[model samples]
Structure formats: structure tokens, C-alpha cells
Target chain A: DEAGITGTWYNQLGSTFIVTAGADGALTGTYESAVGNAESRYVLTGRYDSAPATDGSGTALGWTVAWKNNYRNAHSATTWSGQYVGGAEARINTQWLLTKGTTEANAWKSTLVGHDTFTKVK
Target chain B: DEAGITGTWYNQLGSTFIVTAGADGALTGTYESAVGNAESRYVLTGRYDSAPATDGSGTALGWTVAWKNNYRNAHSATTWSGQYVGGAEARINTQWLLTKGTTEANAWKSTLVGHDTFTKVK
Candidate 1:
């Protein structure tokens, strides 16, 4: 169990993370947003590191979500990247970058940055 | 299970994806590189969509890897953003951006980009 990672996780911001394992390191899950429609669900996929860290502790993890269907005019795809902490309690801490579908020149400027941590539903 | 995730996958390029599920939709795993050290293991963290998609297909997925340990002066932390394709066969296709730890001036220029797909190890 990579950082005990197969269950329901809730973020302080009210976003919900539900995920399950598949063949290999592939992962599929849904994210219920606290923002936008305030419960609109988005689908996601991603991978995790199977081995231990080479330097520090924990493992690396990341995933992305496209807002094509969930939010109106939401043409951005967001990438959540972070670490999986495994202890008596498990938590996933992350930094996310949302890319807005905008002009090539304004794209970088329009990128949104944020942070959040998902802990077990406990 | 989210797209039947939670196992081992390999890319045509020879990189291996080994992941396991934790509580929630979180994923933990290691990526064995084919290039650089040719087996240099790197840790990773990421998330998946627990629900189904509303648009065209599979869910979105992403993760980030800090090469501070694996690669020599890797200074770059790479993020893998992509999707998990589910069907008779499951696959994870991704586009990655590697950001080098550099001056603000060379940062964007030092960023690297690429793509790959992970298929079941079977």
C-alpha cells in the first residue's frame, strides 16, 4: 500500500478525493469540487511511486483533471502534484497548477497556483 | 477499482511504473527511468478521479517527481499530467514537463517536455 492510498480523502477546502487501484501503477478516481458548482464532480487519472524515496521520506504522486464538462466555460486542466505521507496517519499534501485555456501569450499569466492537503476521511 | 489500477506498468521506452493504492484515490509508486542512470529509481506522488467522466473518455491523472535524489543535480522536478484510458485494455498516457532549478530567466527555457504511455506489465 503506497502510503495507504486507497480510500476517501477530504481536503480542508471541501474537495473530496476517491480513488482505487488498477493494473500497474494506474489510478482512476473522481474529485468532488467544493468550488465551481460546489459539488460538481470531475474525473481524474494518475500514477504513484511504488518504491521508497531516494533522499527524503514518503513518495511522489500526481494527477490532472479537465473541467470540460463539470464547470461552465471551464476550459482549464489542472495538475495536482505532491507527496504521499505514510505514518500512523496518512495524508497527501499537494501543490496544484491550473492551466487556463487562453491565448498562448496569456496562458502562463492566466495559470493559477494553489495548495491543499488531503487526509483520510477519519 | 479506478480503471483497474494498482499494479505494474511498462512503457515502450523501457520505463517501469509500479504503483499501489492507499486510503482514498491517492497513489504511491516508483518510476524506474530508462534513461539517465538507466534504473535510477525516483519516488512519486499523485491522485486519480474516483468518479466517472462527463466528457469524451477516461479520467485525468497527474503527479510530480523531484529529481533531487535520483538524477545527478537533476534540479528539475518533473510533473506528469495525463489520463487513464480504460477499456478491454487499460493504459495511462501522459505529457510531462520537467522544470530545472534555475534562475528565473533560464527557468522556462530549462523546462523540458515529453510524453509517454504506460501499459499493463502483463
Candidate 2:
């Protein structure tokens, strides 16, 4: 179901990501050991923009998400493009980029500071 | 099953907790914005001690878990008394106490620092 995004996830390095969905399409949660920095955990709040289900699968289908974090006085953002994998075992796989700065110019400075894959923990 | 502990969780304050289980029943993960510290996040690693199933349900009836963290040089530990709720929807509810200290004397100094509830997030 589309509810797949509302859960927990982890990486091989033991980093954790917990996400929750709001009634208004708002996504909020936290990133522990974010961006490979063990001490740099941060608060994450974001939104999701879903694409039309071209095949009418009655699922979350494909979505583009962007979230922001304020950690140690540093403002950062992460965006993910992913889709729900509908099967006996539900999952979502996304390729994400985490970057610093809030503006286009500043974001350009760190063209690609970090990127990774997110798989549903459930 | 005993596997209910492996997932993500959150509280009303938007704090996130993600946990993973190892082959040896070792629990490792992260606590984002832990213990009411919006800017304070930490890594968590713990182990579970399960009680024998008295009803032959073949499930993890109950467990006591303890985890530790080193955040900003402050050493802390969290202990949980949780039980797996086996039904159509599986969940685990835990009452946890978080304390800090490396020595018994230091641990006693804090006496009791933080306490809260953790519900499975899958």
C-alpha cells in the first residue's frame, strides 16, 4: 500500500531513518547518524509529490520527496525519487541526495555531497 | 514472533528511534533527537533478554533490553521492559528509562534522568 513510506529504515553502517506521514501530505521524522556522520543526527520534515499511477495500481506509485534538517546550526536538504514495490512483501526503494545550503547557488557548491539507497525496514 | 522489535518508532515530539536485530539478538540502531533534546541525537546499541514462553505460544513473550550511547562525550544507557503483542497486528510496547554514567557512583548521581514509552513503528 501507499502507507509503505510510514515506517523505519536502516543502512549497513547502522544508521537509522524513521519517517511519519501527515494528513496533508507532509512527511516528518528523523535521521540518525545522517550523512555518514555518526554524531550528526537531525530532525527531518518534508513533503511528497506523487505522480499519477499510469497503470492505475491503487498504490502510492511513484513520488518525489524533499526534506529539510537543521543540525548544529547547519541547514540541509535531502530529496528522494522512489516508488512502492507492490508484492507479497511491500517495500520502497529510493535514490537520495543529501546536501547543504538553502539556495540554488549554495546548493550548487555541493553538487553532490552524499547519496544513498533507502529500503523499507518492514 | 520475536522479530517485532526490529523496526522504527516515534513519540509525539517527533523524536525517532530505529532498531535492528542481529543474529545474536543484539539490538543496534539510532535515537534521533533523543530524550527531549531536539538538537541532541545519539546512536543506540542494546541486547534483549527474553523470558520463556509459559503458554507454548512459540513467541517472544517478554524481554528486558539495555542499550548504551556516547553523545557529546556523555555516556548513557537505556533499558526497556517490553513484550510482544501477538495478534493480527503485531506490536511491542516498552517502558524505558535512560540514564547516564560509566561508574556505579556516577550512575547513582543521576538516579533517574529520563523515561518514556516505545511502540513498534511497523
Candidate 3:
């Protein structure tokens, strides 16, 4: 219910991306999928913020991302976004789901792409 | 085993690669894969051809291609190639076997990447 974070976060898969707090507790950023067809997608435009407390002490801790691929059927392009769930290390475990078409005959596929660890630079 | 047929055909996978009418109907061409990882390999160099008849009522029909991945083990690159088995239609369903290692101790992986239909345009 609460969407606001302002701390550093990392992706456990060994890549780096950024999350910025938006106008009304909104969060946005971009990430890269490293394997099985390297691709980059956009995160949710407005759904998160910095955590309530900075847990990395002074190191930019990591966050989690959960998103859906919108328009993967007609269009090959996809998008996603996620948030910061408090933790000590600079890593977050995220998942994704993809849907296509509009009926039972519609095809659906799912896959994941991320770094092993996201050490916060900020 | 007739080895020479020259008729026009089509790929079920909606591909547009060509098999030439060589000295002994040795099949040859390239095709593209739509999903997953895609790669191209050459077929057995001396095994395909254009149909014996001026099929397609005088138009170039198609042929079949069966190729193997030769070096998918030590190196990331894989190769395949094959020939036609004489059919009235400009289409051929060729199979491929992939070996990825130098011997039993080495690892192996197999995959197929070709147009569903190989319609002869030449």
C-alpha cells in the first residue's frame, strides 16, 4: 500500500540499474536481462520509493522488481517496474509473467533475465 | 534416388531461403529461426538438387535441407548443412543431429533451425 523509497539497491545478478522516486511516491528505472537473448526493458512508471530506513548502513542497498510484459503478442517490445523491500545486502529477487492474445488459444511464455548482484553505486 | 528437381516452394515457418540446382542436385541455402536462439549451418554439400521436371509448370519449386551442428561444444558457434531427397513438391522435411563434444566425455547439445518449407525460386 505504501510506495516510497529513497535508498541504494542492487540486482543480485551482477548488473546495475537505477530507481528514482517520482512525483507522488512513484518509482521508475531501467534494467538489463543478461542471458537467453539479451534485452532491456522499462520498469513500472509509478509504484515505489526508497525504504523507510536505510539498511545498508551507508552502502546503497538493493531492491526487488516484479513486472508484466505488456503487449508482447502484437508487439515484440515489453516493459516492467518494481520496488525496494528492506534488506541488508544489495540484492533483490524478482519474478515476471507474460501473456499474449485474448482467448484460450492465445499463447503465453515466461522467462527471467537479470544480473547476479546489483551493488548500489548511489 | 533422383537428385535433381527445380521448382518453386515455400517455408511453413515463413522463411525465404534457396537451395541451388547443382551438378548432382546438391542442396544448399540459408534459413532464419523465429524464436529461441537462432543459428545457421550448412547441409551435406553433395546431397540436393532442383527437381527433374520443370515443375511449378516451368517455375522453380523447392527442396529439402538437413544439416548438423559440428562444433557446438568447444566453441559457441554451431554449423549445419544437408541436401534434397527428390520430391515432386518444392518442399522437404530434413532432420539434423547435433554433436557438441570431442568424445563421450565431452558435453553435447542439439537444436534445429530452418525454414519449414524450402520452395525453389531458382
Candidate 4:
């Protein structure tokens, strides 16, 4: 059986999140961007609140992505927090925080937040 | 209260795993090395099997480390799989696998496996 977090999840923001959930709670994945500001793709790392079952229902999970588009170098991470909602029609509910600037801005100004719900690619 | 996985855990082989568990099941931490072949420190990425309680009792988790020591490039990864053994002493039990040779060896030969139990650092 596939873990709920293991599969392709698509959002309204043009970003696609794909994940592989390990039995040991290990997380590995990729963040693909269709938007122009970010890179086309980046490696993702994260964890699940618990090892998920095939449906991925109710399990909370989160991950981090680095755009490699920071101040003269790579960094300025985008961190995502979310949970899986499985049923007749499965989906993932998510919220995210993205870092802006490369330590050049104040803490308050450097943090950006957003939310989106995603459905399996099918 | 700190989640069970949110503490400093050390193994006998001179490596220390320090983890910070997020409320959303997100995991962040560092690995410190006192050994020679590996780098002195690395940023770790992983997940918890479940959102652990303050005592970290019975939570399963795993993480990954990139040694920056692969095929003249940073590619090979060291992954760890383990669980928290909470109780009177509060320790973490773990098993791990590491990849070597940067593609120079066969799949079976390239992977190395080991076991170790970790204790929480006071």
C-alpha cells in the first residue's frame, strides 16, 4: 500500500509537490515550480507526524525547499506544513512560509506566508 | 513541552543527532561529527512517525545527511532510520545505511548498513 503522503499533489499556485514517505518516517521529495520566480525544481526534505497508511488520511506532514535563488547564492527556503485528507476524493490541505531576501531584510519583512489545498494528480 | 524527537541524541561512533520537531510534523536538526572521514557537521532533514509527546516515547523517525563527500561532487547520501525509546533513561534506538563509491560500485556493494543505539544528551 502507498502512504498518503507518497504521490503527486497539485495546488492552485502552479507548484506541484511530490513526496515519498518512508516507513521509518523518513521523508524525501521534490518541489516543482511552474511559476517563473522560482527554479523549475528543487529537492525537498521533511517529515510526517506519524508513519502514514495507504490512504494518508489525517496524518500531518511538512517539508522544506530551497530555491537556490537567494542573494548571490543559494538559500531562502520555503517551508511547508500540511496534512492529508483522504476520502472518496483525496486531497492535501497545506499552509506555507517562504523566506524572502537573503538576510538583507528585517526578520518581519523576510518572512512570507500562504495557504493552498492540493489534490492528487490522478 | 519539547516533542520526543526534539533533543540532542548521540551514538557511540562519535556522531551526535540534534533534532527539532515542529508541531506540524516538520523536522529540522543537525548532525555533528567527531569522526575523521565525514565532515565535522551537516544539516539534517527528516520526519517523525507521529508527532511525539514531550517524552518522545515510542516515536519513530529517520533523517538524511549529505557528506559533500561524493564522486568529486555532492550526491551520495547517508540515511538513518530509527525510533525513540522513551522511559526512565530516555534514549533513541537506531539503524542506518550509507552509500559509497559515487556510482563506482554495484548497488549491493555501494550500500553500507549499520546499527547503533543513541542516548539523549543531558
Q: Pick the lDDT winner.
A: 1
Per-residue CA lDDT of model 2 for A1-122, tens digit only, reads 22656778775445676777555334456667544333455444433322213442312211211221232322323333233444455444433433332222332242232234455552
Ranking of models by DockQ: 1, 4, 3, 2
Give the TM-score of chain B in candidate 3: 0.39
Q: Which candidate order results from sorting by TM-score in descending order?
A: 1, 4, 2, 3
Query: Candidate 3: lDDT over CA atoms?
Result: 0.37
TM-score of 2: 0.36
**Candidate 2 residue A74 C-alpha distance from true site, Å:** 4.4
Q: Docking quality tier of candidate 1? A: incorrect
Docking quality of model 4: it rates as incorrect
TM-score to true structure, per model:
0.53, 0.36, 0.29, 0.47
Q: Encode model 3's per-residue lDDT on A81-116: one tens digit a residue.
A: 333444444333343322222332222122222213
In model 1, the runs with Cα more than 4 Å from the true position are A37-39, A54-56, A70-73, B1-77, B80-122
DockQ scores of all models, one per candidate: 0.11, 0.01, 0.02, 0.04
- The alpha-carbon deviation from the true structure for residue A51 of candidate 1, after best TM-score superposition, in angstroms, is 2.3
Candidate 2, residue A84: CA error in Å?
A: 2.8
Clashes of each: 45, 0, 58, 7
Per-residue lDDT, model 4, residue A42, is 63
Provide interface RMSD per model, one decimal: 7.5, 22.7, 10.6, 16.8
